[PDB]
Amino acid sequence: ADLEDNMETLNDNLKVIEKADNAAQVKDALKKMRKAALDAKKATPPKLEDKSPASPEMIDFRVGFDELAWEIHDAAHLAKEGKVKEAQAAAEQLKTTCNACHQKYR
Amino acid sequence: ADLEDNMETLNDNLKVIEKADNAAQVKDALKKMRKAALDAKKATPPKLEDKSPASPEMIDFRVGFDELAWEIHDAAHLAKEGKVKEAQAAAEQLKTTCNACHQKYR
Amino acid sequence: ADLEDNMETLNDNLKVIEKADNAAQVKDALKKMRKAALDAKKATPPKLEDKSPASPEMIDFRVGFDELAWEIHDAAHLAKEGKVKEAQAAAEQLKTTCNACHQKYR
Numbered sequence: 001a002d003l004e005d006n007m008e009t010l011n012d013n014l015k016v017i018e019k020a021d022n023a024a025q026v027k028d029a030l031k032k033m034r035k036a037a038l039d040a041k042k043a044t045p046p047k048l049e050d051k052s053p054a055s056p057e058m059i060d061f062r063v064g065f066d067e068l069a070w071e072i073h074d075a076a077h078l079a080k081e082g083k084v085k086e087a088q089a090a091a092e093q094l095k096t097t098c099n100a101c102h103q104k105y106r
Numbered sequence: 107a108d109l110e111d112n113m114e115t116l117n118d119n120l121k122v123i124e125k126a127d128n129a130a131q132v133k134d135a136l137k138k139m140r141k142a143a144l145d146a147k148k149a150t151p152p153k154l155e156d157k158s159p160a161s162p163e164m165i166d167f168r169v170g171f172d173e174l175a176w177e178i179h180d181a182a183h184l185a186k187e188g189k190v191k192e193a194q195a196a197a198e199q200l201k202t203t204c205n206a207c208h209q210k211y212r
Numbered sequence: 213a214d215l216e217d218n219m220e221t222l223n224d225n226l227k228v229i230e231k232a233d234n235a236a237q238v239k240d241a242l243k244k245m246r247k248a249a250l251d252a253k254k255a256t257p258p259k260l261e262d263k264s265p266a267s268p269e270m271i272d273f274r275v276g277f278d279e280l281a282w283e284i285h286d287a288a289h290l291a292k293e294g295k296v297k298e299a300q301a302a303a304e305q306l307k308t309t310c311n312a313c314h315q316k317y318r
């Protein structure tokens with residue numbers, strides 16, 4: 001899907017994790033985030049439309065989602081062993097990676 | 107940033123507000139809107155390129171962003187109080203200011 | 213193409229028209245606008261996903277692209293007969309149809 005759609009998937013499930021009840025809600029929301037972050041790697045963001053497709057900015061953009069997907073996965077590990085509160089805290093820390101990419105390319 | 111990017115920022119965050127679930131998002135989206143409104147005030151829109159830079163039309167254009175910035179601020183205050191629906195109602199009334207300027211200078 | 217992609221096409225080519233220097237560039241810009249308008253007619257905009265597929269709002273949306281396509285046609289005519297200044301002038305009144313649909317459905 002489109003880049004804005006994948007971002008809405010990231011944003012909406014991050015809030016689900018904030019409010020979540022049990023590990024299953026967290027784990028399901030985190031798996032949807034990981035799919036969206038990988039799908040986002042296929043996109044060219046408007047601010048980099050004019051750059052060459054393998055420019056250092058475009059590489060920085062794409063690897064930002066590898067970084068995000070791995071941090072998502074670390075939080076999902078906490079949830080799958082049942083450390084729901086720690087999973088939620090790890091998910092809140094994802095905002096730093098979100099915000100780092102945004103201040104460059106959003 | 108260019109007028110066009112500022113307008114994308116305004117439209118994109120308005121849509122984020124319309125779908126938002128908590129006050130924190132609405133607040134952060136409104137703050138990005140206020141930045142882009144003030145930055146857009148520096149631009150000369152294509153329709154007014156051949157008029158004096160201090161023409162009544164250019165003053166009207168620039169004051170429209172003061173108005174938009176203050177209206178955004180009113181909605182931000184509702185979001186800061188946690189009143190999600192009220193801040194969403196106020197953000198939706200922003201369209202009247204968006205529309206009014208477009209009718210003249212789009 | 214999805215709705216937003218066709219909108220970017222409409223917007224980019226209207227800007228090309230505003231600053232064109234030959235009737236062949238205009239002619240080319242208008243027909244990519246026509247294709248994007250007709251392709252956009254196939255979409256359901258997010259704010260009307262809640263209405264029936266042939267609701268009065270969905271009809272109003274689709275027929276808006278017919279009115280767009282016919283105004284684009286009038287512009288392409290003026291351009292094909294060398295009036296160029298009148299073509300750009302016709303492309304400028306396109307904007308009222310852009311604005312009208314956005315005010316209801318964006």
Ligand code: HEC
Nearest residue numbers: 004007010011045061064065068094097098101105106118
């Ligand atoms: C780069 C590596 C990014 C990472 C990591 C995240 N986001 Fe993002 N985001 C990015 C861009 C380039 C854009 C602009 C897209 C456009 O076409 O305008 C965005 C946008 C958003 C949005 C707005 C979506 C919309 O409908 O307009 C949201 C709500 C958003 N981003 C949230 C978000 C979250 C919660 C992230 C981490 C969990 C995250 N993003 C990561 C670039 C990047």
Ligand code: HEC
Nearest residue numbers: 109110113114116117151167170171174203204207211212
């Ligand atoms: C004048 C005082 C304006 C106000 C208030 C708002 N907008 Fe605007 N907009 C204005 C102009 C002169 C233009 C054309 C220049 C341009 O950027 O193309 C626009 C255009 C837009 C667009 C498309 C622009 C693009 O991407 O190139 C959008 C999506 C848009 N405007 C949205 C928008 C919203 C949601 C507003 C209120 C929150 C708003 N604009 C206010 C002038 C003015």
Ligand code: HEC
Nearest residue numbers: 114117215219222223257273276277280309310313317318
């Ligand atoms: C209805 C009949 C429309 C007409 C005619 C035009 N547009 Fe449009 N546009 C429409 C909708 C419902 C939407 C929202 C789509 C969404 O998924 O949110 C849009 C959006 C745009 C945008 C994108 C703004 C953004 O996402 O940042 C642009 C730049 C835009 N529209 C421009 C545009 C122009 C230049 C038009 C006339 C030539 C025009 N639109 C007509 C619906 C309709």
Ligand SMILES: [Ca+2]
Nearest residue numbers: 004005121216
């Ligand atoms: Ca979108």
Ligand SMILES: [Ca+2]
Nearest residue numbers: 004046114118
């Ligand atoms: Ca965008």
Ligand SMILES: [Ca+2]
Nearest residue numbers: 004117118216
């Ligand atoms: Ca958008």
Ligand SMILES: [Ca+2]
Nearest residue numbers: 002214216217
């Ligand atoms: Ca798209």
Ligand SMILES: [Cl-]
Nearest residue numbers: 159160165168
């Ligand atoms: Cl001044």
Ligand SMILES: [Cl-]
Nearest residue numbers: 147168169172
């Ligand atoms: Cl001033």
Ligand SMILES: [Cl-]
Nearest residue numbers: 140178179182
């Ligand atoms: Cl504010």
Ligand SMILES: [Cl-]
Nearest residue numbers: 117204314318
């Ligand atoms: Cl809008």
Ligand SMILES: [Mn+2]
Nearest residue numbers: 179180182183
């Ligand atoms: Mn105040």
